[PDB]
Amino acid sequence: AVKKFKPYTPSRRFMTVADFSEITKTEPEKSLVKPLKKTGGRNNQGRITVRFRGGGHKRLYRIIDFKRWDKVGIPAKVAAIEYDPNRSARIALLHYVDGEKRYIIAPDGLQVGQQVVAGPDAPIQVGNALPLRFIPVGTVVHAVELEPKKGAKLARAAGTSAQIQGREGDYVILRLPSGELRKVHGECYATVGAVGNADHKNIVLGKAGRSRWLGRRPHVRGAAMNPVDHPHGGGEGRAPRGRPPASPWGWQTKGLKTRKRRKPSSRFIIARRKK
Amino acid sequence: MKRTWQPNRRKRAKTHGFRARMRTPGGRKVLKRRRQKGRWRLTPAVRK
RNA sequence: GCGGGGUGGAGCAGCCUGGUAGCUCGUCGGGCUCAUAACCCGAAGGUCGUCGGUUCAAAUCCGGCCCCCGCAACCA
RNA sequence: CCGAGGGUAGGGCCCGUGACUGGGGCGAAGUCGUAACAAGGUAGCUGUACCGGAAGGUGCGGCUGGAU
RNA sequence: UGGGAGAGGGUGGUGGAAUUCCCGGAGUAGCGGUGAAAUGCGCAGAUACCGGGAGGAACGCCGAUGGCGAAGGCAGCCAC
RNA sequence: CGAUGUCGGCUCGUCGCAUCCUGGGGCUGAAGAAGGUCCCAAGGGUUGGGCUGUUCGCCCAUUAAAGCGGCACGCGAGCUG
RNA sequence: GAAUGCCGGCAUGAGUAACGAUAAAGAGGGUGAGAAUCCCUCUCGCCGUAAGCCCAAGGGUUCCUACGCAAUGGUCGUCAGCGUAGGGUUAGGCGGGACCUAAGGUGAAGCCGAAAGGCGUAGCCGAAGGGCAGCCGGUUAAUAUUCCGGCCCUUCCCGCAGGUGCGAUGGGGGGACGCUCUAGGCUAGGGGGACCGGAGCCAUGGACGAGCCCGGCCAGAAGCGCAGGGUGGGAGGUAGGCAAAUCCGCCUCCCAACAAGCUCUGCGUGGUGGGGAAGCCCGGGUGACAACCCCCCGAAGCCAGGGAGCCAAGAAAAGCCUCUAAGCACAACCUGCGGGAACCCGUACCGCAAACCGACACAGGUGGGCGGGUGCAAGAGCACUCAGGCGCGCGGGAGAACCCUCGCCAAGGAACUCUGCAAGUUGGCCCCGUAACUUCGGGAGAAGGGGUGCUCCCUGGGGUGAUGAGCCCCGGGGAGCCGCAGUGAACAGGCUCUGGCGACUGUUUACCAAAAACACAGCUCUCUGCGAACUCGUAAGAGGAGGUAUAGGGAGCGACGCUUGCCCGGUGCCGGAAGGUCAAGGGGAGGGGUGCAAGCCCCGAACCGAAGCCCCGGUGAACGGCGGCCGUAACUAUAACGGUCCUAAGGUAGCGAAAUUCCUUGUCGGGUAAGUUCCGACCUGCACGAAAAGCGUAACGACCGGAGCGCUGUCUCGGCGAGGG
RNA sequence: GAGCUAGCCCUGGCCAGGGUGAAGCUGGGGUGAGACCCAGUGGAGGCCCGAACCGGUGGGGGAUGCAAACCCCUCGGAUGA
RNA sequence: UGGUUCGUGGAGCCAUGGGGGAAUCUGGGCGGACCACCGCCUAAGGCUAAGUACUCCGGGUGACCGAUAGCGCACCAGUAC
Numbered sequence A: 001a002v003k004k005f006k007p008y009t010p011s012r013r014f015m016t017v018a019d020f021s022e023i024t025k026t027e028p029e030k031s032l033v034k035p036l037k038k039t040g041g042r043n044n045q046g047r048i049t050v051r052f053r054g055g056g057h058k059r060l061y062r063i064i065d066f067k068r069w070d071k072v073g074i075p076a077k078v079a080a081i082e083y084d085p086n087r088s089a090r091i092a093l094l095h096y097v098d099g100e101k102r103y104i105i106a107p108d109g110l111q112v113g114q115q116v117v118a119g120p121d122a123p124i125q126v127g128n129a130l131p132l133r134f135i136p137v138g139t140v141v142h143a144v145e146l147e148p149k150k151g152a153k154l155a156r157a158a159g160t161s162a163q164i165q166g167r168e169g170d171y172v173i174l175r176l177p178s179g180e181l182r183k184v185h186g187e188c189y190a191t192v193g194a195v196g197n198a199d200h201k202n203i204v205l206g207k208a209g210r211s212r213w214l215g216r217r218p219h220v221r222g223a224a225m226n227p228v229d230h231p232h233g234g235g236e237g238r239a240p241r242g243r244p245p246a247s248p249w250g251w252q253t254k255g256l257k258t259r260k261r262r263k264p265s266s267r268f269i270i271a272r273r274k275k
Numbered sequence B: 001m002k003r004t005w006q007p008n009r010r011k012r013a014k015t016h017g018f019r020a021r022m023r024t025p026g027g028r029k030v031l032k033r034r035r036q037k038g039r040w041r042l043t044p045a046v047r048k
Numbered sequence C: 001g002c003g004g005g006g007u008g009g010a011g012c013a014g015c016c017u018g019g020u021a022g023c024u025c026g027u028c029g030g031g032c033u034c035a036u037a038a039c040c041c042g043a044a045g046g047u048c049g050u051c052g053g054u055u056c057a058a059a060u061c062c063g064g065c066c067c068c069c070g071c072a073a074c075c076a
Numbered sequence D: 001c002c003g004a005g006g007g008u009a010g011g012g013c014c015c016g017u018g019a020c021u022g023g024g025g026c027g028a029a030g031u032c033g034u035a036a037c038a039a040g041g042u043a044g045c046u047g048u049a050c051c052g053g054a055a056g057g058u059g060c061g062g063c064u065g066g067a068u
Numbered sequence E: 001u002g003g004g005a006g007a008g009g010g011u012g013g014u015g016g017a018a019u020u021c022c023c024g025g026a027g028u029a030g031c032g033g034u035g036a037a038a039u040g041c042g043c044a045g046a047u048a049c050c051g052g053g054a055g056g057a058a059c060g061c062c063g064a065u066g067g068c069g070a071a072g073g074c075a076g077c078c079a080c
Numbered sequence F: 001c002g003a004u005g006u007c008g009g010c011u012c013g014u015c016g017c018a019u020c021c022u023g024g025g026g027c028u029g030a031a032g033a034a035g036g037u038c039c040c041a042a043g044g045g046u047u048g049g050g051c052u053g054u055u056c057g058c059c060c061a062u063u064a065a066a067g068c069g070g071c072a073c074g075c076g077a078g079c080u081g
Numbered sequence G: 001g002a003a004u005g006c007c008g009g010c011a012u013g014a015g016u017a018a019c020g021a022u023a024a025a026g027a028g029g030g031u032g033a034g035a036a037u038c039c040c041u042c043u044c045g046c047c048g049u050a051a052g053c054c055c056a057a058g059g060g061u062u063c064c065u066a067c068g069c070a071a072u073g074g075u076c077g078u079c080a081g082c083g084u085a086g087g088g089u090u091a092g093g094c095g096g097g098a099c100c101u102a103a104g105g106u107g108a109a110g111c112c113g114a115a116a117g118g119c120g121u122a123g124c125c126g127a128a129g130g131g132c133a134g135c136c137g138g139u140u141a142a143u144a145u146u147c148c149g150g151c152c153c154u155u156c157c158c159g160c161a162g163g164u165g166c167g168a169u170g171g172g173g174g175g176a177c178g179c180u181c182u183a184g185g186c187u188a189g190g191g192g193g194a195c196c197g198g199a200g201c202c203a204u205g206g207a208c209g210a211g212c213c214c215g216g217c218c219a220g221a222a223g224c225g226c227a228g229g230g231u232g233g234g235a236g237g238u239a240g241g242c243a244a245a246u247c248c249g250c251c252u253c254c255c256a257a258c259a260a261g262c263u264c265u266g267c268g269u270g271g272u273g274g275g276g277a278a279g280c281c282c283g284g285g286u287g288a289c290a291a292c293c294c295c296c297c298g299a300a301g302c303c304a305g306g307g308a309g310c311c312a313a314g315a316a317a318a319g320c321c322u323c324u325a326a327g328c329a330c331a332a333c334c335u336g337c338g339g340g341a342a343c344c345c346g347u348a349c350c351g352c353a354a355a356c357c358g359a360c361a362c363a364g365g366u367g368g369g370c371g372g373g374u375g376c377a378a379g380a381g382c383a384c385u386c387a388g389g390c391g392c393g394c395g396g397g398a399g400a401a402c403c404c405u406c407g408c409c410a411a412g413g414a415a416c417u418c419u420g421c422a423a424g425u426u427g428g429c430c431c432c433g434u435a436a437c438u439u440c441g442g443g444a445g446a447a448g449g450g451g452u453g454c455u456c457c458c459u460g461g462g463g464u465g466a467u468g469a470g471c472c473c474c475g476g477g478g479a480g481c482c483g484c485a486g487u488g489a490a491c492a493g494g495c496u497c498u499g500g501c502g503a504c505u506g507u508u509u510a511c512c513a514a515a516a517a518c519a520c521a522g523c524u525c526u527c528u529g530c531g532a533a534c535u536c537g538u539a540a541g542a543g544g545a546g547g548u549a550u551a552g553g554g555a556g557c558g559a560c561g562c563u564u565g566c567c568c569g570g571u572g573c574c575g576g577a578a579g580g581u582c583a584a585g586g587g588g589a590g591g592g593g594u595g596c597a598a599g600c601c602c603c604g605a606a607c608c609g610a611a612g613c614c615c616c617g618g619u620g621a622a623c624g625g626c627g628g629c630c631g632u633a634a635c636u637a638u639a640a641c642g643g644u645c646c647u648a649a650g651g652u653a654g655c656g657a658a659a660u661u662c663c664u665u666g667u668c669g670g671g672u673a674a675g676u677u678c679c680g681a682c683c684u685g686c687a688c689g690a691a692a693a694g695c696g697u698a699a700c701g702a703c704c705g706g707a708g709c710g711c712u713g714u715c716u717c718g719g720c721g722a723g724g725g
Numbered sequence H: 001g002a003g004c005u006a007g008c009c010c011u012g013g014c015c016a017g018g019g020u021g022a023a024g025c026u027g028g029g030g031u032g033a034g035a036c037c038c039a040g041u042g043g044a045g046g047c048c049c050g051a052a053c054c055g056g057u058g059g060g061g062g063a064u065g066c067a068a069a070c071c072c073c074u075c076g077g078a079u080g081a
Numbered sequence I: 001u002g003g004u005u006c007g008u009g010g011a012g013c014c015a016u017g018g019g020g021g022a023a024u025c026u027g028g029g030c031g032g033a034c035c036a037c038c039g040c041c042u043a044a045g046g047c048u049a050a051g052u053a054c055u056c057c058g059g060g061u062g063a064c065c066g067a068u069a070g071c072g073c074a075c076c077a078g079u080a081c
């Protein structure tokens, strides 16, 4: 339930911030936080390879457990739900009966002080992880390994989820958050339920400064530039694109499909995305 | 206003210094030439 | 300056490829209707902007003149 | 001290008027169509939405004050 | 206090018929549509038939001149 | 073209006369007053404002009159821009 | 003899401009061959959130002293940051190293690249970050937390005693963190004292005083006192912290919980060691047995790792504590005490500048701390002033024009000009009061007005203390006094009405443009299923992202409001297993060369044969495009209506002489005495129009228009005065 | 060659004083309970005024300069992109 | 595809990044597409003086310079700046 401000500044008119209601702990588990190296968009050559990045708030990276088969059968208690600035979702702190502590990302409806567990025989109850084949067909699910033992890859962003449609052999058919129908291997783990913090998309950053807080530096349009800088650069006064709208590097940017043609995973995608 | 020369003994030494020269091929050939020409000082004097 | 046009009453084909001008509307006479329109059957009307030339023969090809749009008239 | 009123500044209400603009009423014999009264030739009316030279048309839902 | 009837309302659950679309099969020269047609769709294999899948929406018979609500209004089934 | 800096304004003027006013005249379809037209005449004078970058032009209020040109469309080693 | 030739010399301009902030000078005395310029004294002025003091960077003997004046110094020079010579920088505690890690750099392993080289986990290097033991005073011409004095402390080595399962580059804890706001108690610093110490002073009309002037402290171990921070104790189980673990984590059990206790800082006190003024006398000596106390103000600094709220969610490693492991318990470590040991480098001086960066002793540039007092509402603002430091390295005269900076002005008041350009006006505080419109915040300091000093009297509340006095802080009422004037000096908005453009705060052409331009939240399209797309790279490898479609790349549009129409024929993109074309390769009908021949060698048709192109569709917040002629109504005029040619389709809502209208100063209305601009309308829109968005929009703007009030030397129209030339 | 300048990374530091007064919280009120209203408390913000600091709007001076971008008056930002 | 005079040319020869892939003398390469004949030569392992190139160094000699010449430097020069 996003929070509103009164229009006591120009920017507070539309600025909205998250409610943080589901959060119970306001400083991270010291045993699970390591420093996050800000890059500013530059690679090991020193070159900007992703434009308009930098200048954002300092952050500590929280180690997240995307391979919950690491601890089969060991029930954990949900001890907290915390902010993670490296994510759109929230994270939940788990106290295993083992004594070990880990971070998973928080599904919607997960309550502190409840049990979760992972394994082939786990109950079909929000927050539990099972290999995809044992989850009943029709279930919503998140944090899905794209390949067995390689790590939870799909549906990790706030509010997202994947639904299980059916099976054929060693594979189950998933409706991804995009609408794509894909075969994913049944031995791939997945956590039941959709990711929490669904109102994340309903936030209005409100002013330019908020973008700078998130590390996002001002984007400058090709039309604003000169021909030495962009296909859209130049012109006396304003100017329409005057050619197929291109990127800074020459390729067309309004429809040109860029997925590799002979990519071996094509055998497993069933229906390309919707909308 | 603010001019271009803003001296700094660490910057001077780590940029034009002797050990900076020997590390790269062009730096070595710089020292090679200044030797050949007979320069009294092959690298800037900066007293740390 | 460059380009395209002028032909029955109105709006357009024919000109490029010389001989023969055609389409819709309108106009005239007749039908149907109690009557009008619509509709149906028939018919008339154009020397092709003008003068000159080529030709056996010019709406048609070449030249001038009249006119109509369209484009340009930049560095100053 | 108060004090008629004069002066400066800012409000409120009404009245007349105003290039132009909106529809309205009325006007013996204008132009276009034919929406309604017969099932009026697509039953009509209706609240709303969108559209159209115009009456209107159409979608959604409702009413019979609809025929057979 | 003891009982009854009911599409009264809200939440969640779920069941079948139908249409569209998708895939496999089999199959051929038309399908569709109207007052009559054309547009459209079909040898790039449609229409018609069978099997599988996805999804949304509305609840056939019961059903009635019926029942419920203050009105607007309320119809598969189950539970709160 | 191994550089002769543009329009307009401001400042400072100076000359020409094809004269706007003032002085002297002839003719008048000149009664007077006031005009028309032409001749002589360059001594002096020839206003303030609204609009526009404007020169010009239109307008307001006056005026004896609100003249027209030349001086590198006078004048940026004088100003403005 | 010429090349705006080259190098050098010397002219011309010319005794000309200038001699570098307008903070400012004058006299006496001295030194000396020589003095506006050096030394001393008295008087005058300037800075004083500095133009004073202290660090850092950079500079590198410029520091102190003697002797010098050729050049350097914009003049002079006896002087100097100049010449010559001598002297001067002292550390276990300050800073750096023998400690740690950050970005980054490097790089056993490993990967990659013609060569050169590029990557890369560990590890190593890397600091103004972490960690770590010295405070006060004296002394030199010149160094001082470094020498000396006083009082403290750290580490290493060996020894003694007491205690313990001792032991680590391995495990764990800790270190360890943001932004704003902030409590309590202190310290720095400051104000006052009718108290304490002091050489003195009585003037020029008065005062021998509760007179004037000066000063009234700094450091300190243990112990104690005040204020804080940090911190539960025990037991059982244990599968996790990549071996172990008695530690940590997880579970249950029993006690203590705003406490207390234990520990750790700050402040006060503290044995003791130092300091100690004005004035006088020659940096010294005296004052002086100096005194060293009371009250108030009081931090942004301290207690500190304090508290609270918020979102944008806020380093690492070591020291340190704990756990164990090999090994070892003749050890080893922990504690207390003693003796010994404790290396290298910096240390002068300048340091908002005459010593650094600007060719200069250059009106420019340069990070951190301290930065006193009074009054003005506050303050680091402003005026004066303390400590301290200066008068800016050419002067003297004169009293023109003209230039600069400044003061004033009769009557008028924008008549100036492209334009109120510039300069006036307004100006802080307290109180009264405040419109359209609005997104209900705003517009707003709207507008406009009153008050403001000093004296006497009465009184309300707060802090400290005690609840009282005292000092200090917010106030209210009554009566008066004076001047032209009471924020009496200085610092301190002119206002309003209405358009255009851009929502807004922001950004930009360093050195002619700060804008209407860029950015911006927000909207849409499109790409991307992750070894993502995209980007940098030959590659390895990186960014993307330790992210996963509520995400990431690209593009246009640009808050918000109401909206965004028709065209897919062309171009782009997307879809389409048919057809057409199509390269190498397959195929080899059929020819050729050569040989006696077996054979070797060459050419070569049909046919099969990818993408691309053709072809069939889709697609506009994709590139883009959105007609002409003629006729028609019972006055005229004009056409709701009609005819016909064309097109892929013929511009919709809204707006319109516009940042767009050529003809144009269109026409009409408003405002003006007068209006090529302005504002409101009309619509024959040369040549608006809907995300190169269309039409509006409160708020905002050193943006560009128009008008008005206020006020003025802008002007009629100039005059006088000041200072630097 | 990034000791100027531009962006980013890591690590530190700086921003006098005054003004306005969001949410929340407390109490009151209101209702079936609510929404909501009022007062107090609170101290939010690419909020407002104005030094330091960062700028460079208009004008004047300077133009073989004090200066190869300076000086004076004035003006913008100043808890934030 | 490179080398050769050889730029696709009748394009051999020498070399070789890709593909296919033998033989040991009765074997193999060459004589400018190719074939016959006639000849030359023995690939896929290595080494090898001398004659040749150069002048930092030393000496000798000039119809070479003679301080603006001759080396940038006759001299404390790759210095000062």
Ligand SMILES: [Mg+2]
Residues within 6 Å of the ligand: A003, A004, A005, A006, A012, A013, A014, A015, A016
């Ligand atoms: Mg909001």
Ligand SMILES: [Mg+2]
Residues within 6 Å of the ligand: A018, A019, A020, A021, A022, A023, A090, A197
């Ligand atoms: Mg939340």
Ligand SMILES: [Mg+2]
Residues within 6 Å of the ligand: A036, A037, A038, A039
């Ligand atoms: Mg990263």
Ligand SMILES: [Mg+2]
Residues within 6 Å of the ligand: A044, A045
């Ligand atoms: Mg790197």
Ligand SMILES: [Mg+2]
Residues within 6 Å of the ligand: A045
């Ligand atoms: Mg590199």
Ligand SMILES: [Mg+2]
Residues within 6 Å of the ligand: A049, A050, A051, G535
């Ligand atoms: Mg990029």
Ligand SMILES: [Mg+2]
Residues within 6 Å of the ligand: A040, A041, A042, A048, A049, A050, A051, A052, A053, A054
């Ligand atoms: Mg970037």
Ligand SMILES: [Mg+2]
Residues within 6 Å of the ligand: A086, A087, A088, G547, G551
């Ligand atoms: Mg994310």
Ligand SMILES: [Mg+2]
Residues within 6 Å of the ligand: A082, A083, A084, A085, A087, A088, A089, A090, A091
């Ligand atoms: Mg989160």
Ligand SMILES: [Mg+2]
Residues within 6 Å of the ligand: A146, A147, A148, A183, A184, A185
């Ligand atoms: Mg799989």
Ligand SMILES: [Mg+2]
Residues within 6 Å of the ligand: A201, A203, A204, A205
């Ligand atoms: Mg958003």
Ligand SMILES: [Mg+2]
Residues within 6 Å of the ligand: A056, A057, A058, A085, A213, A214, A215
């Ligand atoms: Mg961020």
Ligand SMILES: [Mg+2]
Residues within 6 Å of the ligand: A211, A216, A219
């Ligand atoms: Mg963005």
Ligand SMILES: [Mg+2]
Residues within 6 Å of the ligand: A219, A220, A221
């Ligand atoms: Mg942009």
Ligand SMILES: [Mg+2]
Residues within 6 Å of the ligand: A222, A223, A224, A225, A226, A232, A233, A234, A235
């Ligand atoms: Mg551009």
Ligand SMILES: [Mg+2]
Residues within 6 Å of the ligand: A224, A225, A226, A234
């Ligand atoms: Mg541009």
